[PDB]
PDB file of C-alpha atoms and ligand atoms in Angstrom:
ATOM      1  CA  UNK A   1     202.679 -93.617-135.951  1.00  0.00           C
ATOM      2  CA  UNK A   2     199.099 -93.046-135.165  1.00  0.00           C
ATOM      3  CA  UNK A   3     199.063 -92.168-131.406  1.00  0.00           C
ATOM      4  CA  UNK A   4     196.365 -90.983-129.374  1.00  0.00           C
ATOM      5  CA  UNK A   5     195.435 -87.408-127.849  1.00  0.00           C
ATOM      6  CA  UNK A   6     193.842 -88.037-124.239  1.00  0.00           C
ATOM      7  CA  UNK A   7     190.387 -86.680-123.649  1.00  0.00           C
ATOM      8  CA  UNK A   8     188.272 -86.917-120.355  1.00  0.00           C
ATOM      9  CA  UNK A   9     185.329 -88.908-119.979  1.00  0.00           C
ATOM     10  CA  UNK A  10     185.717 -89.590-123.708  1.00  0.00           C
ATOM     11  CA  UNK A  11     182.715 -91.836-123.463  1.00  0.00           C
ATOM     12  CA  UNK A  12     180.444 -90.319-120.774  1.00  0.00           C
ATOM     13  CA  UNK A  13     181.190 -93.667-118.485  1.00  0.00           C
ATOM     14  CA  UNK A  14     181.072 -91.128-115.330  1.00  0.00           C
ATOM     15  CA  UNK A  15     178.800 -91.024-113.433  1.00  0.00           C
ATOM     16  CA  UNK A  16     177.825 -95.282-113.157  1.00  0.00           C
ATOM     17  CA  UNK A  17     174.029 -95.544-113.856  1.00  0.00           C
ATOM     18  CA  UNK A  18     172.816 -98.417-112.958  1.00  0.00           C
ATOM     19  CA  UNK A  19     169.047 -98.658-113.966  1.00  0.00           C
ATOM     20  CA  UNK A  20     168.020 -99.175-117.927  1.00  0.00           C
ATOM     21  CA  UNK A  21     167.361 -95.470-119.319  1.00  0.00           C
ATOM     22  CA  UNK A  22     167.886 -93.728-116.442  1.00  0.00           C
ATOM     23  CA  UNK A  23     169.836 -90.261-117.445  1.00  0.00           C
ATOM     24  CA  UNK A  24     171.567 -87.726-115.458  1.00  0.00           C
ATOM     25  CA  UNK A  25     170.358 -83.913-116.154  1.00  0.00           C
ATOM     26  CA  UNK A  26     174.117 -82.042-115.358  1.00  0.00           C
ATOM     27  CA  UNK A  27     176.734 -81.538-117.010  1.00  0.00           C
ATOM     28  CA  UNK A  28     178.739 -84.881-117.697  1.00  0.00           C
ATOM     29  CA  UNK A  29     182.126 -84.613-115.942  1.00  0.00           C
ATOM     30  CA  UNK A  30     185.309 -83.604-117.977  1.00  0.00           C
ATOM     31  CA  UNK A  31     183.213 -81.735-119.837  1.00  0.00           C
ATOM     32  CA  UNK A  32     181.783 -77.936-120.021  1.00  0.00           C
ATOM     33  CA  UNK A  33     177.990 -76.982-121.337  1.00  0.00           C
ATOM     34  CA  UNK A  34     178.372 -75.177-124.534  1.00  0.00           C
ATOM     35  CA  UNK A  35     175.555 -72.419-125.021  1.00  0.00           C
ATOM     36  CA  UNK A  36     176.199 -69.670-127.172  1.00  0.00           C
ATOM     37  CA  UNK A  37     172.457 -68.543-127.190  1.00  0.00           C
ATOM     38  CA  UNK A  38     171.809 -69.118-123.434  1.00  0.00           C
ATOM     39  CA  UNK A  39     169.149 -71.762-124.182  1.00  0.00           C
ATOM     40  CA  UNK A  40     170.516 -74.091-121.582  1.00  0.00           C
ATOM     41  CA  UNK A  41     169.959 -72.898-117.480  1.00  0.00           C
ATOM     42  CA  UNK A  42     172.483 -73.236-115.106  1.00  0.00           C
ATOM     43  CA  UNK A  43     170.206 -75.649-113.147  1.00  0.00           C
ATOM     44  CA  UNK A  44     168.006 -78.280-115.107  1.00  0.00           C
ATOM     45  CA  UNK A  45     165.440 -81.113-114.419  1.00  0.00           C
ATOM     46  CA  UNK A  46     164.084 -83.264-116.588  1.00  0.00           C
ATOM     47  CA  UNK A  47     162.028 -81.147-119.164  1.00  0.00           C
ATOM     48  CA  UNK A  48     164.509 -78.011-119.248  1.00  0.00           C
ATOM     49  CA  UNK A  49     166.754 -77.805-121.764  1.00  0.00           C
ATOM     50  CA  UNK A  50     169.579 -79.887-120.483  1.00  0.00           C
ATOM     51  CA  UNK A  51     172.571 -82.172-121.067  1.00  0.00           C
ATOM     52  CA  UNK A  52     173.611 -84.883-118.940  1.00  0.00           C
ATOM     53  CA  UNK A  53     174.595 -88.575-119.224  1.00  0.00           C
ATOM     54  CA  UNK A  54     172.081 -92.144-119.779  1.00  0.00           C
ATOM     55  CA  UNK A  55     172.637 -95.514-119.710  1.00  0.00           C
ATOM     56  CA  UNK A  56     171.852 -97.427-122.766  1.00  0.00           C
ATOM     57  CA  UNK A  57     171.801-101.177-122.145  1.00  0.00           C
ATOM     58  CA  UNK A  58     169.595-104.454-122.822  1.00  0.00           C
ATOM     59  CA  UNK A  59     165.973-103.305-121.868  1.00  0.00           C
ATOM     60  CA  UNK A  60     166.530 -99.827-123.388  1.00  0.00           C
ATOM     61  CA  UNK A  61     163.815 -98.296-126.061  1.00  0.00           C
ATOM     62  CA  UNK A  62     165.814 -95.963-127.401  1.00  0.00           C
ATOM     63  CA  UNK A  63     168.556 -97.873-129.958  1.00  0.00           C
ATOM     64  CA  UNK A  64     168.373-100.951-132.095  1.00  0.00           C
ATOM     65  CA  UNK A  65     172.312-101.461-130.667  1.00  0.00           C
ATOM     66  CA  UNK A  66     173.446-100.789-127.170  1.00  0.00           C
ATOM     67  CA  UNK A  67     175.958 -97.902-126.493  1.00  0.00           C
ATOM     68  CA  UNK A  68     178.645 -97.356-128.920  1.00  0.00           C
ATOM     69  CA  UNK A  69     180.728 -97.646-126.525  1.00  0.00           C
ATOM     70  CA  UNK A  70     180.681 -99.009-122.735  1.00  0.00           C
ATOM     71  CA  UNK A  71     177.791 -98.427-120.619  1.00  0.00           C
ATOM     72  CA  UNK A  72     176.565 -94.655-120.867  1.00  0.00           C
ATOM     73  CA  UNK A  73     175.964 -92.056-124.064  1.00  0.00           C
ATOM     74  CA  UNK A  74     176.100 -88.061-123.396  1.00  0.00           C
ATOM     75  CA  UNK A  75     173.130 -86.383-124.611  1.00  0.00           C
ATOM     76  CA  UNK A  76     171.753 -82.885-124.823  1.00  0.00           C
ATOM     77  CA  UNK A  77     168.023 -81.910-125.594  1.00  0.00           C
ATOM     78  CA  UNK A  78     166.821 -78.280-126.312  1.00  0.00           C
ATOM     79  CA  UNK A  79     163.107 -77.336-125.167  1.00  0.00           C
ATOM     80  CA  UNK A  80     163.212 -73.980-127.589  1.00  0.00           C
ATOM     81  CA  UNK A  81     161.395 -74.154-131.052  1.00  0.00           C
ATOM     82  CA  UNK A  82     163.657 -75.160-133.811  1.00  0.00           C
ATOM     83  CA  UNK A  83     165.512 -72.051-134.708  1.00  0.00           C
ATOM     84  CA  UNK A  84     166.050 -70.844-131.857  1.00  0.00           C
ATOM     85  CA  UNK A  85     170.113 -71.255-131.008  1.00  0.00           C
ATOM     86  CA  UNK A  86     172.499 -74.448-130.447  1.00  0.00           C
ATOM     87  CA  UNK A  87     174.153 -75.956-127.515  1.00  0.00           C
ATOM     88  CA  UNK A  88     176.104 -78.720-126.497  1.00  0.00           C
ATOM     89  CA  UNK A  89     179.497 -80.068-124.521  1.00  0.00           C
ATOM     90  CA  UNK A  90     182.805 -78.487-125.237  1.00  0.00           C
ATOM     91  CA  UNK A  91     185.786 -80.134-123.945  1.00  0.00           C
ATOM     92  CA  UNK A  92     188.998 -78.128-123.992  1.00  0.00           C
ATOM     93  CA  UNK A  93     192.311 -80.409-123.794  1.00  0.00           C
ATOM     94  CA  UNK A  94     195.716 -79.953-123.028  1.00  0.00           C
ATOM     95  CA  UNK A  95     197.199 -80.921-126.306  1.00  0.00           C
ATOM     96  CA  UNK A  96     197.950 -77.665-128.198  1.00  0.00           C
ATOM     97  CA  UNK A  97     197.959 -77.660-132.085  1.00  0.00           C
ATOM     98  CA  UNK A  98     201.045 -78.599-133.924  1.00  0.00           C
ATOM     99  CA  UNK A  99     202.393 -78.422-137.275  1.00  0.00           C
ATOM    100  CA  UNK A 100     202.507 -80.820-140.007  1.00  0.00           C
ATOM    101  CA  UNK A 101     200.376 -83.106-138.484  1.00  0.00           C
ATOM    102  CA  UNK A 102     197.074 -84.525-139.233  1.00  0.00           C
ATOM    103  CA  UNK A 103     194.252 -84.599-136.665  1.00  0.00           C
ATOM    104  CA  UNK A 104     191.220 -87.360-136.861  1.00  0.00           C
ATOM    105  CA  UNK A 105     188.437 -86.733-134.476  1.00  0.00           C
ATOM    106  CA  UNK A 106     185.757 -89.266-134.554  1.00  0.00           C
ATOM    107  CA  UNK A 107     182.415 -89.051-132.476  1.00  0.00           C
ATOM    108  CA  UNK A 108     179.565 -91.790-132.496  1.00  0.00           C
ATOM    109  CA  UNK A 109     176.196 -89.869-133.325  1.00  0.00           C
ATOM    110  CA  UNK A 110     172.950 -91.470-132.391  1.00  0.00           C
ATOM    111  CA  UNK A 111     169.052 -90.375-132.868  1.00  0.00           C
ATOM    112  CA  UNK A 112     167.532 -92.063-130.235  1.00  0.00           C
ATOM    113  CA  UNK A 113     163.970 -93.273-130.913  1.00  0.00           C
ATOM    114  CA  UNK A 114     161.074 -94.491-128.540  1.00  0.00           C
ATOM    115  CA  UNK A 115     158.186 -92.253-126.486  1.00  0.00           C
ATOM    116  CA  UNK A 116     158.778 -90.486-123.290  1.00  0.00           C
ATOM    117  CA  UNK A 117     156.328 -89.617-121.162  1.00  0.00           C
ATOM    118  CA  UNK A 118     153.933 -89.929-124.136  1.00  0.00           C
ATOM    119  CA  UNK A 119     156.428 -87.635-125.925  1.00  0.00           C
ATOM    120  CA  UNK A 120     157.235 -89.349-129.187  1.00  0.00           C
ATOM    121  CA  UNK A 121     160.919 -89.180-129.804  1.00  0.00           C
ATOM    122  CA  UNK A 122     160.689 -90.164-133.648  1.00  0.00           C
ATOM    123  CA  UNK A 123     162.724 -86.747-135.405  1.00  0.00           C
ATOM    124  CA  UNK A 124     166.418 -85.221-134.775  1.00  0.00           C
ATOM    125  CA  UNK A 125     167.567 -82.024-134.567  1.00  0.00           C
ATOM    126  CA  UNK A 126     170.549 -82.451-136.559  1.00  0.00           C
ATOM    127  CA  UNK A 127     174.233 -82.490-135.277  1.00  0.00           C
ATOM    128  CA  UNK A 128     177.582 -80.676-135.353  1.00  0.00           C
ATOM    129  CA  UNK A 129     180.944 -81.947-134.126  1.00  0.00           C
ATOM    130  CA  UNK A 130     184.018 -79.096-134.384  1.00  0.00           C
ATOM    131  CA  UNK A 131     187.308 -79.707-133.412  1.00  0.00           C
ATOM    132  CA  UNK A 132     188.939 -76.191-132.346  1.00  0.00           C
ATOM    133  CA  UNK A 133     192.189 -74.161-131.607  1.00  0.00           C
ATOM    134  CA  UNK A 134     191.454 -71.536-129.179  1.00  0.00           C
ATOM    135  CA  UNK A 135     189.073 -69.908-129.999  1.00  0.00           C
ATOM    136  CA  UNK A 136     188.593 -71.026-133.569  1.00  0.00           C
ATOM    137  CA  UNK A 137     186.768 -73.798-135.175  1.00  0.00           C
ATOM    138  CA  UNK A 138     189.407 -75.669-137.165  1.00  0.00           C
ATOM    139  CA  UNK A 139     187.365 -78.169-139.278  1.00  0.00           C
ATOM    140  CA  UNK A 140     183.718 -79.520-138.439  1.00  0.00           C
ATOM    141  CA  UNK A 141     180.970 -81.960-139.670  1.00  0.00           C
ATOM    142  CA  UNK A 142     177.717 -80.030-139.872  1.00  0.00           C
ATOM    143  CA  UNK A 143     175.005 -82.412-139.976  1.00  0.00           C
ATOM    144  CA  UNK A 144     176.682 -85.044-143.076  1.00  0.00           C
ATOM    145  CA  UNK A 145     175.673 -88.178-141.801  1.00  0.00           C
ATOM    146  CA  UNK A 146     171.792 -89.304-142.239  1.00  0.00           C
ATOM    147  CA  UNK A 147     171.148 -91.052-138.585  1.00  0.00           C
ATOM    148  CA  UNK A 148     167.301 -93.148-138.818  1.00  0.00           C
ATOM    149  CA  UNK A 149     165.650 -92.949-135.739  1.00  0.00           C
ATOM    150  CA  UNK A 150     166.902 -96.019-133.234  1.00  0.00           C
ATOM    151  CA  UNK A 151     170.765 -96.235-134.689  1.00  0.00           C
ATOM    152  CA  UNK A 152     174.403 -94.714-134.156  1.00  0.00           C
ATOM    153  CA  UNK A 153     176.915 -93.685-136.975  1.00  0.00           C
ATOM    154  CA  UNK A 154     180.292 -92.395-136.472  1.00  0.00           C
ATOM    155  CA  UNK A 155     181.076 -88.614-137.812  1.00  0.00           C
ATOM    156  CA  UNK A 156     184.794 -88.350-139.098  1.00  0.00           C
ATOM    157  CA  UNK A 157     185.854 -84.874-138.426  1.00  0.00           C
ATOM    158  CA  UNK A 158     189.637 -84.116-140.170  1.00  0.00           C
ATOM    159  CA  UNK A 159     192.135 -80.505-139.636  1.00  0.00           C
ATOM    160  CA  UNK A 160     195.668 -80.794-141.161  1.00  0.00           C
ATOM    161  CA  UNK A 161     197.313 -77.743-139.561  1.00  0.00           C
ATOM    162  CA  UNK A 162     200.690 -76.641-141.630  1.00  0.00           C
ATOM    163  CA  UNK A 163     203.560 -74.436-140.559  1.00  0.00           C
ATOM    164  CA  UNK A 164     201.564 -71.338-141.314  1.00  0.00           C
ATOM    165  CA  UNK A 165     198.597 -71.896-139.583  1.00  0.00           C
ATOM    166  CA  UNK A 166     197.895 -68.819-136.986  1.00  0.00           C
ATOM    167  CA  UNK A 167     196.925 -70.911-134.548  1.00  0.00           C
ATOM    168  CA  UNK A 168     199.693 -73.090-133.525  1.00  0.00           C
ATOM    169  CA  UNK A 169     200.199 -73.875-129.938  1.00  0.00           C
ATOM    170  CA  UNK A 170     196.931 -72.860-129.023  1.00  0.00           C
ATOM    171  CA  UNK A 171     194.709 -75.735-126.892  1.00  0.00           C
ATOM    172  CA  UNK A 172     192.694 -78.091-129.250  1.00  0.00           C
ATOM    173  CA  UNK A 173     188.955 -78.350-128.309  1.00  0.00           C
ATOM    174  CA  UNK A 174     185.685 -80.386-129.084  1.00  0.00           C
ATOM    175  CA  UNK A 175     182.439 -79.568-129.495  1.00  0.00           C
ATOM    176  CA  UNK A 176     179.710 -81.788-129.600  1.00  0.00           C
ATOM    177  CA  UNK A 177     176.514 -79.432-130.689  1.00  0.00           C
ATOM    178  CA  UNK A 178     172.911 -79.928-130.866  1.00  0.00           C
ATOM    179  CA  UNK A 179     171.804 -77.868-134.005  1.00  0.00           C
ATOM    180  CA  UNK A 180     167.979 -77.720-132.890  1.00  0.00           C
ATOM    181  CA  UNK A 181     166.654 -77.755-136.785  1.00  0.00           C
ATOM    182  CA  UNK A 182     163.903 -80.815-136.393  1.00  0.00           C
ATOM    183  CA  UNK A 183     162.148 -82.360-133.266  1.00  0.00           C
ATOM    184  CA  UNK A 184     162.212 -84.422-131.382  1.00  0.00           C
ATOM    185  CA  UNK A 185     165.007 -81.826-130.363  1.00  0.00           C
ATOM    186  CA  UNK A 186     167.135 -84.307-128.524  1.00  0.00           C
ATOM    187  CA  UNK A 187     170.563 -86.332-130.110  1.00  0.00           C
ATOM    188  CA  UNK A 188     173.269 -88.624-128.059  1.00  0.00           C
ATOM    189  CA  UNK A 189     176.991 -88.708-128.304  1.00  0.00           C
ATOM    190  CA  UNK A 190     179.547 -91.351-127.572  1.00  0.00           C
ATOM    191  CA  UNK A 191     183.402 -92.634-128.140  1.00  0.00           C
ATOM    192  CA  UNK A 192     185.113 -89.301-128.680  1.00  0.00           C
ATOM    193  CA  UNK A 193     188.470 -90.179-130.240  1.00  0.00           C
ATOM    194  CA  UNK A 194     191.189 -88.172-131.463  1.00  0.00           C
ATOM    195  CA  UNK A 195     194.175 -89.584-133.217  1.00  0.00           C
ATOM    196  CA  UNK A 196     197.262 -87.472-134.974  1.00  0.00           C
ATOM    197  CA  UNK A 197     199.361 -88.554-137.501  1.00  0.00           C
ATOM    198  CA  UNK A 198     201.689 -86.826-140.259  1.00  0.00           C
ATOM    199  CA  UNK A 199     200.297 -84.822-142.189  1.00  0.00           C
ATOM    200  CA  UNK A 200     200.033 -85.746-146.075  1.00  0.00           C
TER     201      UNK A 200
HETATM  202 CA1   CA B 301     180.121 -94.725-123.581  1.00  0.00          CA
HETATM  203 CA1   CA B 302     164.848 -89.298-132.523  1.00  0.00          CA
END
C-alpha cells in the first residue's frame, strides 16, 4: 500500500533538448521559481542568476553518470556572493495533507563538475529539499548528503502528519533550494518522487 502522489514534470523531461549540455535559462514547466530574497530576475540569460532545464547525456562534462533519470536534470545557479539569500523551484500539488499517513519524498541531488566558459565548476553551494503544507515547511533535508563534484545522490526527505496536525487538508508542496553557502554556486535536481503510506 505504497501508492504514488502525482507531480508535474517530476524529472524536468520538458522541454526536449537535443544537443549534449545545452540548458534552458526559464523556469522548467510544472514548476514555479522560488526566491525569497529576490536574487533571481524575472528574465535571465546565461550568466544571471537563473534556473532552467539541461540535458545530461553521453558527451556531457558535467557527471561521471548520465541523468538520474531520463534525458534532462533541473538546475538553478545563483550569481550573488555566498550569503547572500536562497532560491530554487517550488512545485505546489493538488494532493492535500492527510492524517495518519506517512509521506516519502525523494529528490536526486547532483554537483555537477567540469569548466564553463573557463569558469571552473569544481565547489557546491549546498542543497535543501522541503516538503510543505501551505504555507509551512513540514520536514526538510538541509544539506545531509556529501555530493563530490561529478556524481548524484538521492536525499530522503520524511513528514508523518497525525490527527492533530494544524495543517491537514492544506496542498502539499516541494521545494528544491539552492542554499548559496560555497561556489561554484550552481547544483542540479532530478526524479522527484513522492510516495505515502501508513503511518507507523
Ligand atoms: Ca530527468
Ligand atoms: Ca560543482
Amino acid at each position: 500500500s505504497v501508492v504514488s502522489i502525482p507531480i508535474n514534470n517530476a524529472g524536468f523531461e520538458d522541454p526536449f533538448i537535443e544537443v549534449v549540455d545545452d540548458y534552458t535559462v526559464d523556469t522548467p514547466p510544472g514548476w514555479t521559481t522560488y526566491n525569497p530574497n529576490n536574487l533571481v530576475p524575472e528574465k535571465r540569460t546565461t550568466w544571471t542568476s537563473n534556473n532552467g532545464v539541461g540535458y545530461v547525456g553521453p558527451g556531457t562534462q558535467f557527471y561521471n553518470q548520465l541523468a538520474p533519470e531520463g534525458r534532462n536534470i533541473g538546475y538553478i545557479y545563483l550569481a550573488q556572493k555566498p550569503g547572500s539569500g536562497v532560491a530554487g523551484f517550488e512545485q505546489i500539488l493538488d494532493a492535500t495533507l492527510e492524517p495518519d499517513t506517512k509521506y516519502t519524498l525523494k529528490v536526486d541531488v547532483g554537483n555537477f563538475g567540469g569548466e564553463f566558459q573557463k569558469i571552473s565548476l569544481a565547489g557546491f553551494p549546498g542543497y535543501r529539499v522541503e516538503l510543505l503544507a501551505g504555507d509551512t515547511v513540514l520536514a526538510a533535508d538541509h544539506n545531509n548528503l556529501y555530493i563530490k563534484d561529478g556524481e548524484f545522490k538521492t536525499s530522503t526527505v520524511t513528514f508523518t502528519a497525525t490527527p492533530d496536525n494544524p495543517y491537514l487538508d492544506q496542498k502539499l508542496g516541494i521545494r528544491l533550494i539552492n542554499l548559496l553557502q560555497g561556489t561554484f554556486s550552481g547544483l542540479d535536481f532530478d526524479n522527484v518522487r513522492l510516495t505515502v503510506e501508513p503511518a507507523q
